[PDB]
Amino acid sequence: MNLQEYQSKKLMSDNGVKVQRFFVADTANEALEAAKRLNAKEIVLKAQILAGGRGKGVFSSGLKGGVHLTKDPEVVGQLAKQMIGYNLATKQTPKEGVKVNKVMVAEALDISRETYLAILMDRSCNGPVLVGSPQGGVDIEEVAASNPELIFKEQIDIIEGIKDSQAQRMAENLGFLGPLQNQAADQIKKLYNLFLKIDATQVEVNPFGETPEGQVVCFDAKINFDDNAEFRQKDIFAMDDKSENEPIENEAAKYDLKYIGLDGNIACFVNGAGLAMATCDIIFLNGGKPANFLDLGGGVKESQVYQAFKLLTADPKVEAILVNIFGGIVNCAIIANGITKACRELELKVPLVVRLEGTNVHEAQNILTNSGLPITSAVDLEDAAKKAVASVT
Amino acid sequence: SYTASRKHLYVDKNTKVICQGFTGKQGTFHSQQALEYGTNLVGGTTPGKGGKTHLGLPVFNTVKEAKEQTGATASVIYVPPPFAAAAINEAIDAEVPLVVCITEGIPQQDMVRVKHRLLRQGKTRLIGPNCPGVINPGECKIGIMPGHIHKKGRIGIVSRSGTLTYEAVHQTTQVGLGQSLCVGIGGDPFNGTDFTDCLEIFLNDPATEGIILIGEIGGNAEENAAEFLKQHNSGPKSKPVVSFIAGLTAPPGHAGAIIGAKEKITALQSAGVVVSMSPAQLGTTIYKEFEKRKML
């Protein structure tokens, strides 16, 4: 899970990390009301998108930058009108872009030096690792590829925690000299402690800046949170806007159903992300375009099989539903009655191709074939795919 | 080293299994399936229910208690995520040779700490978490995989995907090859067993003549598996390796990039792996590879 910048920034300040004073506005004229509310020597305008690369990204209006800097609150309302509502297409967004619904007006600070710092769990590094570079700001991946020697790594022992010798060494490799070395090392420690506290998979600060007054500040923050830790990060996961996701995605999540929309007409209902992708893969192989796949997860409950049909059919783009359940924890005959019951109780139009191979399949297929419902059973994955592309004629 | 515990991945009919989370909803169902399939399930554990009887088997409060009473050598975990990591630790403390954690949803931080200790010992071998388990067809089934689709055979299957593994299994049985050993390593980033761990066992198992590797987009696990096969599998006793990478048609911070299906397929092929582009042709591809090499 990912939060906006104005949400991560708050978490950082509450844990001793130095960040910029900020305000968020939903309109362009309100961004002017907030720019004046700062009482700032300068004001920074930052489009709020969960993707990175705002600096050199262009909007659908002509504005060449998701980030702008001005000294007069009157210019923010003009630039804010060129941000809110538009898609911001950057290096890491879809070519169509992402609609910008919020913008950040913050007490802008001067940046004497830009560095890159990141804390994340990395499989190869076997646990947390500090990743930093003195060549921070804007493109970090460019310098990471050109000059690998400018990337410094410090593997942190999850048990011992971050030691002083490690924070000092990283701070020195990032170029923090004089009294700023111990100040940066202290921010690195508080960042790592925050990284562990919020069950983050990645805390990325770019630029890990250095003001002329000698204050180490995190100017931009991108915190990625472990979805598995939501049960112990309730306050944080409540902050998830959910607005940047399709409404059906949020609706499927209500019933413990993960939805991934696609540009096709054959909806897919599968148990297992790996199988769902394989189902989509084999549909292309036979000329079809899957409209989406609704991953069911191991936990099957006859209530969500009823719902699953509801969400897929809610989208008019769905011209067919492919059910592929293989090796579930619940008996197939139980899923067979939930499918029929759902069909009977919902008046299904789109053709329905069902493949069941879990436990007690012989009875399940009989429940479907002898139901008098528009249900054609499938034997294997290839059969269901070929039968799904055929039903879209 | 922890690699010394690789051997414990190859369960057999003599493996005596206990179920952590025995009386739980999941543990009951899959424990019944394990007994009906012929697995030597000799009890389980649930805190506060030691002494009671469950599925005709004894219930214990702790894993070590169950181990000294039943001589168990393998353990399967269905404990919920908040306490599944501690359940793995309880088995490592008891020095259970093989631990299989089925539970999905364990915080990554918990598994980072678990794997930290796991790598510093060599007595316990962990499979998972968030995995379907391991099965020696006909001899031992530790996990959630449907048993009826398996049949003891000649193809060692390793899969990073869940239910997708069953497709490779069902196909290898229909083509008459069957499976020697099937291992699901799970879909979590921090786990006790990776591709190379299983490939090592396959390449040294006489019963395993062919290998199927099921993968998907994300990370570099498939890339690492390729490098492993390039050096150790290229030779006179090279065993045919087939693979399918899910998400070929799937659509697409900076720290992860600092330290992609197409790259995986090309990497596996460079090591000699025959990559089936269709998820339904894993059995036919390996079958014809056996035919090319006069292995049938």
Ligand SMILES: Nc1nc2c(ncn2[C@@H]2O[C@H](COP(=O)(O)OP(=O)(O)CP(=O)(O)O)[C@@H](O)[C@H]2O)c(=O)[nH]1
């Ligand atoms: N003077 C000043 N400049 C700023 C301030 N905030 C951002 N900038 C400048 O604008 C740039 C915008 O970068 P930023 O939005 O943080 O990141 P990005 O362009 O999306 C690239 P990445 O995703 O890797 O962070 C900064 O690199 C810096 O040069 C500020 O408060 N004051």
Ligand SMILES: [Mg+2]
């Ligand atoms: Mg940034």
